[PDB]
Design a protein around this motif. Structure first.
Motif, short mmCIF file in Angstrom:
data_model
loop_
_atom_site.label_atom_id
_atom_site.label_comp_id
_atom_site.label_asym_id
_atom_site.label_seq_id
_atom_site.Cartn_x
_atom_site.Cartn_y
_atom_site.Cartn_z
N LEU A 266 0.82 -1.20 0.00
CA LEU A 266 0.00 0.00 0.00
C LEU A 266 0.87 1.27 0.00
O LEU A 266 1.00 1.93 1.03
CB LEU A 266 -0.95 -0.01 1.21
N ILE A 267 1.48 1.60 -1.14
CA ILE A 267 2.11 2.91 -1.28
C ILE A 267 1.05 3.99 -1.49
O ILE A 267 1.34 5.18 -1.30
CB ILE A 267 3.13 2.91 -2.44
N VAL A 268 -0.16 3.59 -1.86
CA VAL A 268 -1.23 4.52 -2.20
C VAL A 268 -2.00 4.89 -0.94
O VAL A 268 -2.67 4.04 -0.33
CB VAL A 268 -2.16 3.95 -3.27
N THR A 269 -1.94 6.17 -0.59
CA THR A 269 -2.43 6.71 0.67
C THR A 269 -3.94 6.90 0.70
O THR A 269 -4.51 7.10 1.79
CB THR A 269 -1.72 8.04 0.92
N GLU B 239 1.67 -11.32 -6.19
CA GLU B 239 0.28 -10.98 -5.88
C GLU B 239 0.13 -9.46 -5.88
O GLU B 239 0.77 -8.75 -5.08
CB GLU B 239 -0.16 -11.61 -4.56
N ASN B 240 -0.70 -8.95 -6.78
CA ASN B 240 -0.87 -7.53 -6.99
C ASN B 240 -2.17 -7.06 -6.36
O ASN B 240 -3.23 -7.64 -6.58
CB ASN B 240 -0.86 -7.20 -8.49
N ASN C 275 2.27 -3.46 -7.12
CA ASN C 275 2.79 -4.76 -6.79
C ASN C 275 3.22 -4.75 -5.33
O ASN C 275 3.81 -3.78 -4.85
CB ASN C 275 3.96 -5.11 -7.71
N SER C 276 2.87 -5.82 -4.60
CA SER C 276 3.30 -5.92 -3.21
C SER C 276 4.83 -5.94 -3.10
O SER C 276 5.40 -5.34 -2.18
CB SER C 276 2.69 -7.17 -2.56
N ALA C 277 5.50 -6.61 -4.04
CA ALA C 277 6.93 -6.83 -3.93
C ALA C 277 7.76 -5.64 -4.42
O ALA C 277 8.92 -5.51 -4.02
CB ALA C 277 7.31 -8.09 -4.70
N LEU D 140 3.73 0.68 -10.29
CA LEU D 140 2.37 1.00 -9.85
C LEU D 140 1.74 1.81 -10.96
O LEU D 140 2.24 2.87 -11.30
CB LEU D 140 2.37 1.78 -8.55
N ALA D 141 0.63 1.32 -11.50
CA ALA D 141 -0.20 2.07 -12.43
C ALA D 141 -1.52 2.43 -11.76
O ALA D 141 -2.08 1.64 -10.98
CB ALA D 141 -0.48 1.27 -13.70
#
Ligand code: CL
Length: 162
Positions: A1-4, A89-90, A109-111, A117-118
């Motif tokens: 979760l880079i997306v806030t 796993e995305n 992507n988790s990894a 990230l799109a």
């Protein structure tokens, strides 16, 4: 979760039906260049199963064909995150959607979140909604996006957007 940012109170049953991928931005130029890019995909329809999973019907340039794929997004505990499987796993994060007009979502992507990230701006009709693209750009000011594609209404109606 880079997306806030993330949808609170998402009714996935309510995003069902057809969508046009009006805009797309990626954290890496290489994810969106040629039509064969690995994240240059065009949503067509969102099918939430009764169990709660999410079927995505997208178009995607495979070889010389505009190939139609169907990806299943499994529900998770979070109502707004779904888990496509499984090279890695995305997650598929839903940021914002009024159900009736737009829907902002990202796959990361988790990894490796920052390097792949799109995010995308879906819209219900083949129009150019500026209120939608603005909200899209608001959501992305904080993300490390390096490519930004935007389509015209006549492109939306052809398959794979030309
Ligand atoms: Cl015309």
């Amino acid at each position: 979760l880079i997306v806030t940012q993330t949808m609170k109170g998402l009714d996935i049953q309510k995003v069902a039906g057809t969508w046009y991928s009006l805009a797309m931005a990626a954290s890496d130029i290489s994810l969106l260049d040629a039509q064969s890019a690995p994240l240059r995909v065009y949503v067509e329809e969102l099918k939430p199963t009764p169990e709660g999973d999410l079927e995505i019907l997208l178009q995607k340039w495979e070889n010389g064909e505009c190939a139609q794929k169907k990806i299943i997004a499994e529900k998770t505990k979070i109502p707004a995150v779904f888990k496509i499987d499984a090279l890695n796993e995305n997650k598929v994060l839903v940021l914002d959607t009024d159900y009736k007009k737009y829907l902002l979502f990202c796959m990361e992507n988790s990894a490796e979140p920052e390097q792949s990230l799109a995010c995308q701006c879906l819209v219900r009709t083949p129009e150019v909604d500026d209120e939608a693209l603005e909200k899209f750009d608001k959501a992305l000011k904080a993300l490390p996006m390096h490519i930004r594609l935007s389509f015209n209404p006549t492109q939306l109606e052809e398959q794979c957007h030309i």
